[PDB]
Ligand binder design. Structure first.
Ligand SMILES: CCC(C)(C)C(=O)C(=O)N1CCCC[C@H]1C(=O)O[C@H](CCc1ccc(OC)c(OC)c1)c1cccc(OCC(=O)O)c1
Length: 234
């Protein structure tokens, strides 16, 4: 296997069993759909999603799964099947996960990637605001209502640029700066230094009114490229 651990300490070793398609791989924040089987190093099977009705899904790069999985799934293409050998430091460590996983266990997973998609940032989960993180930010802190943010933004309608600015403004006051509501909600989910693409459905953008000065008609879907440069909370 190929050592895919950031520290190159052979913590996560990947063997590709079947190559996937295209070039794209899941990004941090993306929802990911896989089937897997897990064995201890001695070949004892402890679990498989194949034994259940649904694919296993999780959000990548958020510490929702063991570190070996956040590392490994990021390297996969759609359709890929790989085997990953995971040292305990990248899995369950000294604690283990009784009764299935003993302390200090090296784990082997077979993983097949079926699908991934951008993160739906909406409260209703109606697909109205979809994010694709390009580059992860620094701290985990995010701007809240009333935070003063510095943001570089590019707005596109049908891939044509209509707005490109570097702004400093208070979250909650974006409307007066011709920023759509959904963009301000998206910024509240971003970390300092993060570069993301955010897709807005009309309901979260300029709705039935549009934005005439930006040549945006009623009921327009928009795409923004956003860089959160800095912010001061509160
Ligand atoms: C050991 C048996 C289980 C948990 C079923 C297993 O097969 C397993 O080992 N996994 C399930 C498939 C993804 C990889 C792996 C896993 O991460 O499961 C994690 C275990 C919990 C965990 C999360 C994050 C951690 O660090 C940031 C962490 O550190 C010890 C523990 C998990 C994630 C989501 C759901 C879940 O259980 C529900 C289910 O069985 O579907 C288990």
């Amino acid at each position: 296997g190929v050592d895919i651990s950031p520290k190159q300490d052979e913590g996560v070793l990947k063997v590709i069993k079947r190559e996937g398609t295209g070039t794209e791989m899941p990004m941090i924040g993306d929802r990911v759909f896989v089937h897997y089987t897990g064995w201890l190093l001695d070949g004892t099977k402890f679990d498989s999603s194949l034994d259940r009705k649904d694919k296993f899904s999780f959000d990548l790069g958020k510490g929702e799964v063991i570190k070996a999985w956040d590392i490994a799934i990021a390297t996969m293409k759609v359709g890929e099947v790989c085997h990953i050998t995971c040292k305990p430091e990248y899995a369950y460590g000294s604690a283990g996960s009784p009764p299935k996983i003993p302390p200090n266990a090296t784990l082997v997973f077979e993983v097949e990637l079926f699908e991934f998609k951008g993160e739906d940032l909406t409260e209703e989960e109606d697909g109205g605001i979809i994010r694709r993180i390009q580059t992860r930010g620094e701290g985990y802190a995010k701007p809240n209502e009333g935070a003063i943010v510095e943001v570089a933004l590019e707005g596109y309608y049908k891939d044509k640029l209509f707005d490109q600015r570097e702004l400093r403004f208070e979250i909650g006051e974006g409307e007066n700066l011709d920023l759509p509501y959904g963009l301000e909600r998206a910024i509240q989910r971003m970390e300092k230094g993060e570069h993301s693409i955010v897709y807005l459905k009309p309901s979260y953008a300029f709705g039935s009114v549009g934005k005439e000065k930006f040549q945006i008609p009623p009921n327009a879907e928009l795409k923004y490229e956003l860089h959160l440069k800095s912010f001061e909370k509160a």
